[PDB]
Amino acid sequence: TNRLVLSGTVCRAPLRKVSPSGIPHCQFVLEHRSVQEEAGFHRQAWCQMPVIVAGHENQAITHSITVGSRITVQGFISCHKSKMVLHAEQIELI
Amino acid sequence: TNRLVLSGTVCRAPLRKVSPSGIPHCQFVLEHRSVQEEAGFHRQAWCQMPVIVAGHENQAITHSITVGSRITVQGFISCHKMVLHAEQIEL
Incomplete structure (x- = not known):
């Protein structure tokens, strides 16, 4: 098993790239405090x-993520x- | 939420430590590969x-674990x- 579920406030805004093969991915940093x-x-x-969001299906949501987003x-x-x-598989907003 | 579930092989044998205040806990290193x-x-x-096991209720389990335990x-x-910070440990 390898499952991490972690809530937090984004402290670095997404930086986005597309691999040469066409795989979109964005990276940001997630600050958890509890x-x-x-x-x-x-x-x-x-x-x-640090969080990586790779693949086409999760990219749209990442455009709502900025520094300060929960x-x-x-x-x-x-x-x-x-x-x-x-490595994100699901992302829940707020 | 802050929940990690992680399986692996113990790669450093458990040690039983104390805080400056004298509070016991066990620690080991868990090598995950998947x-x-x-x-x-x-x-x-x-x-x-690195894993910290602070619940005394987990002391019997942590004493049966050696390097190589899954x-x-x-x-x-x-x-x-x-x-x-371990709350549950399953062998």
Whole structure:
């Protein structure tokens, strides 16, 4: 299983490219901040998560995303060298 | 929402630690590798995720895990470098 569901405020606006083969993709950064319960106590959770939205079907929604937009992204995490990226599969606005 | 569900092989053996205040928790590293669909193509996904297990109710499970154990962990992520704060662990 590889499923991350993460809500946050967009802190870098989408940058958009099309691969040579014609695959559209845009990248932005998603800032999450919340209070989470852990072992009966509350702790602040925070992350700036890079998000990639690849493929034709999810591009239209990304044009409503700007810095300040509140969204939830559901997808899978991928790590390179150690930088992480959330690869979006569903995006919910507000 | 802040929910990560991630399966993998333990690649660093669990250690049982204490906070400055003396609060116990267990930690290990989880190596994930999978094949995911993206834009109609198959793409490899990998991550080595540090995991924190602070619930004492999870101590029996975390003691049966060694390097090589296959597990699924669910919890919330926080960036301190990312760490998965485990709420459930399934063997």
